[PDB]
Every structure is written in structure tokens, then in C-alpha cells.
Amino acid sequence: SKTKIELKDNWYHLDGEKYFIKAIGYEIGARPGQAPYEDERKDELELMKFDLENIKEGGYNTIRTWSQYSENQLKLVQESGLKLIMGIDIKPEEDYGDPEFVKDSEIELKRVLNYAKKYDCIITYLVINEPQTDHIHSVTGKAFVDLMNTLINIIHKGHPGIPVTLSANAMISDYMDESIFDVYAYNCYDHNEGQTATMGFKDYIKGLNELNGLDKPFITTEFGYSVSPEGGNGQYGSNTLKQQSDGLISNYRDLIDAGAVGMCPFYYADGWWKGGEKSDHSLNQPEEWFGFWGYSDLNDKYGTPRPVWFAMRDYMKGLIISPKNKSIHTNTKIPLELYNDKDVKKVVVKFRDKVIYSKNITSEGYMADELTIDPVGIEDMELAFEFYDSDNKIIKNESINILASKTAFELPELTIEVTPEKDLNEGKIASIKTKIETSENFTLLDDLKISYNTHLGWAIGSQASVSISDQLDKKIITSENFFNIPDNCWVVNASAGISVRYGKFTFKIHDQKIIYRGDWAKEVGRKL
């Protein structure tokens, strides 16, 4: 008798009960000295026993991977208690349309499945990681889908039961249809730039989930921050340990708020190989410093935990899935949803230091109820959640800010008209006409931000800060911005957004148009 997994109301279930995937990225054979994709493959049991046990005490219930485990490695997972999201090493840079590569992939995957289908710890297969957009233009979208369909199908027959999705990047693969997959999944990174400066992290991602069709569970497959001594750009690289531990937390909430029902924070331990030399901890190589664990010197096989690890541990102990922070509620009944580890014996919610909800938790896991509020007019509220343990000692505080009311109300809204509208072949030069309907009591602030993200690699393309000082009086704020269209830009994410305040409650308002060049995206691009 083995785990049964079904997805409905957009949640993983595990033998009937909702399961919230509290995962971490993990990669064996990547200690200082090692390169995982270059070295002769070894199981590495002795270190896996150490790591898995750490990841257990670390507060997680799942591990996410990029590369397929052997049978011997699976056994150690299976035994651990931990769930697995297993990546299949399909080189992103290969010609997906090359028959030889397809055949090798079919044969490789089939060999893994032949043993992996006896390990019920596997709760998701990731079919590929970070497929790049120029690449897919070159080898054709047709090739890309046909592969995914081959691979998906093979896994369905080969390991029946188990969701298949891909680890696509939110910031370059926003345009991509994922309806062929059993789950929506994205690698999410918040560098307050391009799309994530316009919409903000929560809404950006949330809007992909909404464009996707809100018909399947949504998970994050990566998110985090590098603590390199130097190097990178903006938030990408060169964060302090404080900033890392604090962004990981600001990521979590924001992504749940976007509606994720599974989380894979990025990377247990550093990997000195990611920056060019397995034996050097390059000081200006961001990729080498993503770990929650860091190695001391070349000789260290173990590492020690950075601050982020203790913060993540503690924060995971009681998750609020609803209400979502920065949610708007035109009602007096607030859906409540928690996932609680076995240590949370009580949960209370306060508003202005008065109790409005108080449930004693009898069993762990998912748990739903309702909160009654009494909002006057339009009322921002910080709801203040408190998780208690057996001795009745608070172990987590977390606050959810809502903007609530008993009746409907207007918000200001921002919409954009983009040139060309439909087909980038229609001109060399683009425009974004932003338009902001203001609303009284709602205060716009600082700077409207514009972004014509041209998808060229990781390059986030043009951006702009437009002051609206001189238009505050007006009901309708307007702004026309131009951009050179690159010849080799295949798709673009035109967006704009501005911050908005009501009392203590701030949120961005924004719009987004994803526009293509000719019909190259006919297959791979999201429909409807």
C-alpha cells in the first residue's frame, strides 16, 4: 500500500489529506572540490545521511533536485522520511528536435523510472530546468513541446500516480504554456527589477497563475539570494547574511500570497563549482554563494548553517495560506487556512490587541476555518497571528495586512496600451502609454515604473522612472514612453506599475502585456 496523490482544488493531496510541500533545493556531489555534472558519478551515501538528517531538523519535508538519483540514493531518501521532487537532467542547451537526443532521453528516463517507480517518496518529476528563450526560438517551440510531451507521457506510463511539471524561470519563461504539465511551476527571484519592479513579486507571479488558468496546483521550484563578497548586480549577488535571511522570508510569504501550495527555497549548501573552478570560492561569483550552509575551506565536507537557516526553520513551523497578505476583502467573513507542524498546539489572531480568533490545534497539518471582522468604511487591518506550543509559549508571530470592507469599493487602476499591440514585426520602435485612474482616499506615491523586458537572456531590457508630481491633482494620469525594439527580441513583457497607500496598507497597481514577434510562439506560447 503506497502513497496516493491527487490534485484538486489546486492542492497536492497525500492519501486524501492536503500536503503543503515544505521543500529545499538539494544537490549532492557539490561540496568544495566537486563538480556534479563533470565528475564520475558516485552515490555519496555517507554525506547524504548527514545532509538529509540536517534537512529534517531544518524543518523541511521534501527535497528538490536537478539530476536523477540512483536506486541506492533513493533508498536512503525513502528511509529518511523525506519526500522527493526529482529533476531529470535534460541538458537545456541540446537540440530538443534532434532525434538522437530524444532517443537518448527516452532511454535514460525509462531506465530511471524502471527502479524509481518502487519509491513512493517521489511526489513530483521535474522534466527540465530553465529553458532559455533564444534557444527555443533557434531549435523551434515545436521541438520543445514535442519533447515535453514525449517525456511527460513516458513518466505517466512509467511511474503512474506522480505529477510531472518543469522548473521554468518566471522572469524569462512568463510567456510559456504549462498547460501540458500536471502542475504549474516556476523558479521565482525577486530582484525588484523588470517585471518585479512594476508588479511586485506577489502580483507578478500571481498574474502568471491567473493567466495560467487557476486550474492546477502552483509550486515554486526555486527562490533565494546570494551572499557573495562581491559581484553580480543589484540584489543578484552581494547580499549580507541579514539580507539573505530576510529576503528568503519575504519571498516565502509573497509566493504563498501568489497562491503557491508548494515551496522549494533555493539551495541547502553552496557549490564552488557553479562559478568556474570547483576548488576556488570565487569572491565575485554569485552562483557560488546561494547556500543556507557554507563551507569553511576546501577541506570542509560538512559546513555550518548561515542565519537564514534558523529563520526559515522557525518560520515554517506555522504557515498562513489564507488570508493572504495584501489581499482585499469586500466581505465580513475571511477564509483562514493554516499548515502547522506538530509543535503548534494553539493559534490566536489579534487585531488592535483584542482576540478575534482562538483555535486549539488538535491534529497537525492543514486546517481551515473562518475569521469574522467588523470593518468600518474601508479599513486597513494588520491581523496579528500567534502560534503557541504545548507550554503555551509563542513560537511564531506573523502579521497579515488586508484592506477590508462590508460593501464593494473602487480602487485606482492602471492600464497600458502598447505599440505594436500584436506583432513586433510591425515596427522598430515601441511605446507604452500608461493610464492611471485615481481614486480619492487612495494615495499614489513616488514613481510609476515602466519595463519593456525584451527577454534577451537575463537582460531585463529598458526601464524608466516617471515622476507624476505635476499630475497629482488630476483624475486621469497619463504617460507615454518609447523604446527601441531589438531585432533579435522574440517576445516582450511590457509592464508598468505604481505603489498605492491606504492607511498602513500599501500595494502596487499594474498592467502587463506579453507580445510576440511573428508566429514563432505558435506552439510553446500560452493560449487563450
Ligand SMILES: OC[C@H]1O[C@@H](O[C@@H]2[C@@H](O)[C@H](O)O[C@H](CO)[C@H]2O)[C@H](O)[C@@H](O)[C@@H]1O
Ligand atoms: O546547483 C543547483 C542547480 O542550479 C541550477 O541553476 C539555478 C537556476 O535554476 C536558478 O534560476 O538560479 C539559481 C541561482 O541564481 C541557479 O543556481 C542549475 O541550472 C543546475 O544545473 C544546478 O544543478
